[PDB]
Amino acid sequence: RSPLEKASVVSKLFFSWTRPILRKGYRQRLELSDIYQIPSVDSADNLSEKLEREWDRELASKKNPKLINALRRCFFWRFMFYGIFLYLGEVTKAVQPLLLGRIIASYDPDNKEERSIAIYLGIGLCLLFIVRTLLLHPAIFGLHHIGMQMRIAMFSLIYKKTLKLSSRVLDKISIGQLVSLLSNNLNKFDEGLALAHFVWIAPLQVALLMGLIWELLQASAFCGLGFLIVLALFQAGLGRMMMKYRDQRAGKISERLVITSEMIENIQSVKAYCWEEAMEKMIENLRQTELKLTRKAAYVRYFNSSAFFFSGFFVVFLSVLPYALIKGIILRKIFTTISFCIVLRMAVTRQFPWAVQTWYDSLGAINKIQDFLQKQEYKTLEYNLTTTEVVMENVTAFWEEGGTPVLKDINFKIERGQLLAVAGSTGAGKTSLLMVIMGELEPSEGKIKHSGRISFCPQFPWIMPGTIKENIIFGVSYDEYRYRSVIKACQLEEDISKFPEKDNTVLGEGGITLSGGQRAKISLARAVYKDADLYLLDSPFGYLDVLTEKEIFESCVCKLMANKTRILVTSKMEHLKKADKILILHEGSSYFYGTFSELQNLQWNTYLRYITVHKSLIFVLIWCLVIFLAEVAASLVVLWLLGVFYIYVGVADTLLAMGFFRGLPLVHTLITVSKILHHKMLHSVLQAPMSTLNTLKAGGILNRFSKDIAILDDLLPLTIFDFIQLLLIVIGAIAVVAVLQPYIFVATVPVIVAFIMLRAYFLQTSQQLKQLESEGRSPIFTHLVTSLKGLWTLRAFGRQPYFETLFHKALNLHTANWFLYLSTLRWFQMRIEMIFVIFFIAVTFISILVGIILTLAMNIMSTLQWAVNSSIDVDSLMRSVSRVFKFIDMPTEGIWPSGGQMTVKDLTAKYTEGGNAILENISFSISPGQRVGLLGRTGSGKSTLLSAFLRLLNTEGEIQIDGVSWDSITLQQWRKAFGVIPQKVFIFSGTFRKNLDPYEQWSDQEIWKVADEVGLRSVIEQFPGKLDFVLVDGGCVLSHGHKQLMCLARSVLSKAKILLLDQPSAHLDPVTYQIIRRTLKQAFADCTVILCEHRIEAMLECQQFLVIEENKVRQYDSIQKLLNERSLFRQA
Ligand SMILES: Nc1ncnc2c1ncn2[C@@H]1O[C@H](COP(=O)(O)OP(=O)(O)OP(=O)(O)O)[C@@H](O)[C@H]1O
Ligand SMILES: Nc1ncnc2c1ncn2[C@@H]1O[C@H](COP(=O)(O)OP(=O)(O)OP(=O)(O)O)[C@@H](O)[C@H]1O
Ligand SMILES: CC(C)CCC[C@@H](C)[C@H]1CC[C@H]2[C@@H]3CC=C4C[C@@H](O)CC[C@]4(C)[C@H]3CC[C@]12C
Ligand SMILES: O=C(O)c1ccc(/C=C2\SC(=S)N(c3cccc(C(F)(F)F)c3)C2=O)cc1
Ligand SMILES: [Mg+2]
Ligand SMILES: [Mg+2]
C-alpha cells in the first residue's frame, strides 16, 4: 500500500515517502510487484461515481447542460485552496528585490540611512526563501493530483458512454479518432492545472510590482508598463494564429492513424500482395501536410516563447531614461529597478499567456468530450413477457437514414421449440434481418415482439483477449457438466488437447494463434453455452468442412437444443429438409415463406544517435554556438574601453538571447529530424519478419505511432531550444562574472557538481518508472479497441458490466503506475530546491556578516535552477526518441515464370523457433499447367503450407519453379510469381479503384472490365460515387458475399503464372458460385491454381489432390481414388 494513507503532516509536506522506492530503484531493477499500491481516492469506481451523479443531475435539471458546471461542483474548493497557496507563495517573489534594495542602502559608504540593520536583513532575506519553498511545491502537487483525478473521471465517463452508441452513430466514428482524443489530453491535461491559476495571479502581481516601482520612479514606471502591454497584445495575437494551425492537423492525424492501424493489423496480407512500397507512399503523402502545418505552427510558438529573452533591455531603457533625463539616476536604484523588472517581465510575458492558453485548451477539450457524450443512443424497449413466440409483421427498414430499402414487407411467426431457416442470394439481407431482430437496426415501419433473452453467433468470429475458458464462459458462473457437454458437442476436444496448457491457454486480440476454422467453433460454443430463449445463429458453418458441419448440425442444433427456438441462416438443402419453416429472401423481399414440402410442390547513447541522423542539425548547432562565442568575446575583451560592468551583466538575458537567425533554423531542422525518424521506423516495420512482428500487439502500435511521434513533432523542438538558451545564458554569464570577482564564482562549482550527481542518481529510477508507465497505458487502448470491435456481440449478450469492470481494472493499473512518478519527480525537485537553499544560506550570510554582488548571485542561482528543470524535462522527453530507435532497430527478413511447375524437397514449417513443427519433411511435385486441389480437416495446416510457399514463416527446405531455387533470387522478386487470395480479406480506407489497385497501373476501362466479369457491376453502381466511394470502417458498407468477390477481382486483375487460391468462396451461395467457376475457367486457363475450397461440388475440377493429415501430405491422382479409403468423407 502507498504510505500517503498513513503518514504525518510533516512527512507529507516534505514528500519523504518516496525514499524507500528511490533507494531500491537506484541500485536495483524496479518490478511491477514492488510498486506502491493505489489509495481509495484515485480508484476509478468511486472517482467516476462522484461525477456521474452530478452529470446526471445537470442533464435532468438544466436546459443547456454543461460538463464544466458538473466538474466545478466536485473539483472547485480544493482547486481554490491550492490556488490560494500558490498566490501566497508567489507574493513572496515580488518582495525579494525590495529586501535587496533595502540591504544595498545599508552598505552604502559612510553610514547611510540605517547602519546597524544589515544583520537583521541578511538573515531574513534568505529565511524568506524557506517559506517560499514550503508554500510552493505542495500546491503544485495537489493541483497535479486534481488534474489526474479529473482526467480519469472523464475517461471513465467516456467509456461508459461509448457502449450505448447506436449503429447509425458508428458510421462517423473510427478507431483512430478516439485514440487521438485520448492521446491528446492523456498527459497534457493534468500538468496544466498548476498553470491554470496564473490568470488571476499575474494581474495582482503586476499591480503590486507597479506600486513598488512607483516609489522608485515617480512617474516613469508607466512607459515600461505600456511597452509590456504592447508585447502582451502581440503575444495574444500570436496565440490565436497558432490555434488555427492546430485545429486543422487533427483530421489528418486521425486519417493517418486509421490507415496505419488498418495496415498493421493485417500486415500479413500486405506482405503477401507485396503492397509495402505502394503503402508507405500513401502514408508519406498524408504526413506531408501534417508536417507543413506543424512547421507553420512551430514558428509562431517560438516567437511567443522568445518574447521574454528579448525584452530585458527595452523595458529597462524605457523605465530609466525618462527619469534619468530629469534627475539622473543612482547606482543603487538602477539595480533595484532591474530586479523588479525581471519579475515583471516574467509575470507579463511568460506566466499570463501560458495560463490563457491552458484555459483555452482545457475548455476546448471539455466541450469536445461533452459533445461526444451528447450523441444518439441505442434503445431496446422490448417486453419481458410473451407466449414464448417470436412474431413480426410488415417490417420495412433502411440502413442509411435517408435510398433503396434493405427489407420490405417481411412477416413470419415461430412458436417455442421451432427452427426457422432463412436463405437467399448475397445481398438479400439475412444478417440485416437478424440485426432487426436484435434491435441494433430500427425499422421505419412495423413491430417486433419477443422475449429479451437472445443469444448471438456472428458471421465473422470474435475472440476477445483471454483464456479459452474465459472466451467460452463470457462472464458467467462456471459449470462442469454443461460446459463439458458443450465443449464435446462443438468438436473442441482434440484441438484443445493439442495445447500444452489444456483448457486455459492465452489468445491474443483476434485469436491470431488459432486458425480460421477453430475461431468459428469457439464462437459457436460461446453462443450455445448461454442460457437464453432464442439462439439466432448467423451462418455458424462458414469456415467448417462438410463432414464437420454434418457432425455438428445433427448433434448441436437438433440434439442438444432441440426444444428452444432458434433462427439459422442456411445455405444448403439438408439443413432445410430438417427445418420447421423456410423464408427465402431475395433483394430484400419475402420471396417465399412456408414448409419444405410446399416449397418442393411450388416449383548518453540516445543523444548522440538522435542528432547524427540529420547533418544539418550539426551544421546548425555549430552555427548557433560559434556566434555565441563571438558574442561572449565581444563582452570580455572590449571591456578595456569601460574599465559599472555589473549593469552590463544584468542585461545578459537580452545580450545572449537567440534571434530569428539562430533559433529558426534549429527549430526547422528539429522537425525534419522527426520526419526522417518516422519514415525510417515505418519502413523498418513494413519490412520486418513475421516472427518478430507477431510479438507486437494491437495496443503496442497506437502507443508508438500516435503519442510517441506526436511528442517528437510537437514538444521536443521548443523544449530543446529553451534548454539550449538557458545553457548559453548561464555559461556566458558565469564565465564573464568569473573575471571581475573570482571568489563568488567558486561557490557555483560544487553546486553544479552536486546538481549533476543528484540528477544522475534520480534518473536511475526515473528512466525505469517513466518507461513502465509509458508502456502501461497500452492495456486501456487495447481493451477499448476490442470493446469497440465486439460492440454488437456485447449488447446482444448483455455482458456490459463485465467489460466495465475490466476497464476499471486497467485504469486502476495505469493510475497506480502514474502516481509513483508524479510523486518521485516532485520529491527530487523539492530536494533540488532544498540543496539550493542550503548552499544559498552561506553565500550571502558569510559574505555579509560590494553589496550589489548579491543581486548577481541571486540572478544566477535562479537561472541555474531553471536550466536544471529544463534539462530534466528534456531527459524525460527523450525516452520517446529512445523507444523510436528501439522500434527501428529490428531484423530485416529480406520471362522467368513461363510454365509454372513446382518441386519441394524436405520442407519444414514452424511459425516460431523451436515450436511444434506443423509440416515435417514435405515433398511433392506439380506438373506444369495442372490444377491442384488441397484437402484435409480443420487444423491440418493448409494455410500453413500456403504461407510456407511464400516464405512468410521460417522454413527449412527448397522450392524451385522452372529451374531456379530459393537462394538464387531475392525474396521480393520471388514473391511476385504468386497471386494469392488470403483467408482474411483486406480492405482499407480509400476509393474502390484504390482498393482494387494501390499502384494505379490499370485504367478505369481495365478495372471496369474485370469488375463486370466478376459481377461487381450491380454493387459498385448502387453507391453515390461509382469507383469513387470512400469505403470506411474497414469496408463495413459491403457484405460478406461481396468482399470475397472484390478480393477475387483483385486476384484476377493481377496476372501471375502461379496462384494460391485460399478458399475463394467462403459464404457465397450456390447460384453465385457459377460466377466463380466462369471466372476460374476463362481466366486461369494457363496458370496452375492450388485450390483450398471445402465445397464437394467444387473439388471435382482438379487433377492432383493433396491431403494433409498428421503433418504430412499424400498426393493422389484420380478424383475417386482418395474417396474410397475413408468412407466418412463419402457418406457425409
Ligand atoms: N500465428 C501462429 N502461431 C503459431 N501457431 C499457429 C499460428 N497460426 C496458426 N497456428 C497453428 O497452425 C495449426 C494449423 O495450421 P493453420 O492455422 O494454418 O490451420 P489450417 O489447417 O490451415 O486451417 P483451416 O483448414 O481451418 O483453414 C493450428 O492448429 C494452430 O495451432
Ligand atoms: N452498414 C451498412 N450501410 C449501408 N449499406 C449496408 C450496410 N451493411 C450492408 N449494407 C448493404 O445492404 C444490403 C444488406 O446486405 P447484408 O449484409 O444484410 O447481406 P447478407 O444476407 O448478410 O449477405 P451475405 O451472403 O454476404 O452474408 C447489401 O446490399 C449491403 O451492401
Ligand atoms: C496587492 C495590491 C492590491 C495592494 C495595493 C497596491 C499597493 C501595491 C500600492 C497602492 C498604493 C501604494 C503606495 C503609494 C504611496 C507610497 C508612499 C511612499 O512613501 C512609499 C510607497 C507607498 C507606500 C506605495 C507602496 C505601494 C502601494 C501600497
Ligand atoms: O518563477 C520562475 O520560474 C522564475 C523566476 C525568476 C527567473 C529569473 C531569471 S530568468 C533569466 S534569463 N534571468 C536573468 C536575467 C538577466 C541576467 C541574468 C544573468 F545574470 F544570470 F545572466 C539572468 C533571471 O533573473 C526565472 C524563472
Ligand atoms: Mg452474412
Ligand atoms: Mg484457413
Author numbering: 3 to 404, 437 to 637, 846 to 885, 915 to 1120, 1129 to 1173, 1203 to 1440
From the paper:
In the human body, the chloride channel Cystic Fibrosis Transmembrane conductance Regulator (CFTR) mediates chloride transport across the cell membrane in multiple epithelial-lining organs, including intestines, biliary ducts, pancreas ducts, respiratory airways, and sweat ducts. Structurally, ABC proteins possess two transmembrane domains (TMDs) forming the substrate translocation pathway and two cytosolic nucleotide-binding domains (NBDs) that recruit and hydrolyze ATP as the energy source. Once the R domain is phosphorylated, ATP-binding induced NBD dimerization and subsequent hydrolysis of ATP in site 2 are coupled to the opening and closing of the CFTR pore, respectively.
We find that Inh-172 binds inside the pore of CFTR, interacting with amino acid residues from transmembrane segments (TMs) 1, 6, 8, 9, and 12 through mostly hydrophobic interactions and a salt bridge. The measured global RMSD between these two structures is 1.5 Å for all paired Cα with a smaller RMSD of 1.1 Å for all paired Cα in their NBDs, indicating the existence of some but limited global conformational changes upon Inh-172 binding to the E1371Q-CFTR and the preservation of a canonical NBD dimer in the Inh-172 bound state. Comparing the positions of the residues directly involved in the binding of Inh-172 between drug-free and drug-bound structures, we observed negligible changes of their positions with an RMSD of 1.1 Å. When the extracellular parts of CFTR’s two TMDs were aligned for the Inh-172 bound and Inh-172 free structures, it became clear that in the drug-bound structure, the extracellular segment of TM12 (from V1129 to L1143) wedges into the central axis for 30°, while extracellular segments of TM1 (from V93 to Y109) and TM8 (from T910 to L926) tilt away from the central axis for 10° and 13°, respectively, resulting in a closed pore conformation. The calculated RMSD for these three segments between the two structures is 4.3 Å.
